[PDB]
């Protein structure tokens, strides 16, 4: 059993309730969304960072346990061209749970972003036995959000 730790603080939301058909229809993988309340995005697992968007608002990480995740802050946030985000980590970086990847400006994004809803999805769906979605409020790098087998 693999526990995915919350990459940001907030409230868990259904991925189906995200205002984006590609995520809502899980074309991109399956998982949950988080209505953010903090200021930073950390590694939800021990693994290696894969790709950081040039707008520094989303990233990919592979856990050591072999799970591929994809954390994308907000909806249509690329349109802000990097405003409100600061890449803290580097592509290829090895990380442990809780390591800071990116910091963001919530209030700014709350004002400028179409939505701050943040999908956390598994992009490896075909390699996993089960995905158990959790519920509630989470605390960055502490509270588990998904359990996988």
């Amino acid at each position: 059993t693999i526990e995915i730790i919350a990459p940001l603080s907030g409230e868990i939301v259904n991925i189906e309730d995200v205002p984006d058909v590609v995520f809502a229809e899980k074309i991109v993988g399956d998982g949950i969304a988080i209505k953010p309340t903090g200021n930073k995005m950390v590694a939800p697992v021990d693994g290696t960072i894969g790709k950081i968007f040039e707008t520094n608002h989303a990233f990919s990480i592979e856990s050591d346990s072999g799970v591929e995740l994809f954390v994308h802050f907000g909806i249509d946030t690329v349109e802000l061209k990097g405003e409100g985000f600061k890449r803290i980590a580097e592509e290829g970086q090895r990380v442990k749970v809780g390591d800071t990847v990116i910091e963001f400006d919530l209030p700014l994004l709350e004002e400028k972003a179409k939505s701050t809803l943040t999908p956390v999805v598994i992009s490896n769906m075909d390699e996993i036995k089960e995905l158990i979605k959790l519920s509630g409020s989470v605390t960055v790098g502490e509270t588990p959000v998904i359990r996988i087998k």
Binding site: V22, I27, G29, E54, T55, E68, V78, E79, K114
Partner: protein
């Protein structure tokens, strides 16, 4: 004196590739009842190709760029196989006795047309991706020749009026020394790709493709925002001395 918006600063030297596309011809002639069954089969037979060819492009995006670009094709493919399109495309042909290329165009154009009515630049771009799916479908039914940007055996610069997300996936990054286009400016993920890829490129040229022929030798300054077409050796030597200053800087 040609100037664009310059999306990525840098310099490059190479041949120019020109993407030429013939205009798609639509038949306004109405079909007869006996032709209703045949036109549906042509659509299914033509749709049968794009089904397998679109899937091939998806696999290239996953290995080439990653899962971030692989799933975008699944949405386009999944939308194309939407059961609403099958019934709506067939109903017009069966009900209005229209042609598959003319009837199918109305269905994809009809939805994209509704999206344009939206007063948002973000929703309008997605309508561009949906429009592209129907645009190629017409070529797939007719069976028009496709250049395919993957058939590049020599390093060249990529010049086009505008590139659709579908081309960016099946695009050879190592054989393309840069990207030049006269699109709007930000464009979908394209102009954005030059930024993230960190390669020299222009997107607001305005009319460079009409001045360039394929196999033309061009030098991209991406620093003075100028393009040199067939420059003498003395001009290159002068440009090389300036490049050395930039390296020192």
């Amino acid at each position: 004196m040609i100037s664009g918006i310059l999306a990525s600063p840098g310099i490059a030297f190479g041949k120019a590739l020109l993407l030429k596309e013939d205009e798609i011809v639509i038949d306004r002639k109405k079909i007869s009842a006996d032709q209703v069954d045949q036109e549906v089969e042509r659509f299914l037979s033509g749709r049968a190709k794009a089904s397998a060819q679109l899937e091939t492009i998806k696999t290239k995006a996953g290995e080439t760029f990653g899962e971030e670009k692989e799933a975008i094709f699944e949405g386009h493919i999944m939308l194309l196989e939407d059961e609403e399109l099958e019934q709506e495309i067939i109903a017009l042909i069966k009900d209005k006795h229209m042609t598959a290329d003319a009837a199918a165009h109305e269905v994809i154009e009809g939805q994209a047309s509704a999206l344009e009515e939206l007063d948002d630049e973000y929703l309008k771009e997605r309508a561009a991706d949906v429009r592209d799916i129907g645009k190629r479908l017409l070529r797939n039914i007719l069976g028009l020749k496709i250049i395919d940007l993957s058939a590049i055996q020599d390093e060249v610069i990529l010049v086009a009026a505008d590139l659709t997300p579908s081309e960016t996936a099946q695009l050879n990054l190592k054989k393309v020394l840069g990207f030049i286009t006269d699109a709007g400016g930000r464009t979908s993920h394209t102009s954005i790709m030059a930024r993230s890829l960190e390669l020299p490129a222009i997107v607001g040229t305005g009319s460079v493709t009409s001045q360039v022929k394929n196999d033309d030798y061009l030098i991209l300054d991406a620093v003075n925002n100028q393009v040199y077409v067939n420059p003498t050796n003395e001009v290159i030597d002068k440009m090389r001395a300036v490049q050395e200053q930039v390296a020192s800087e």
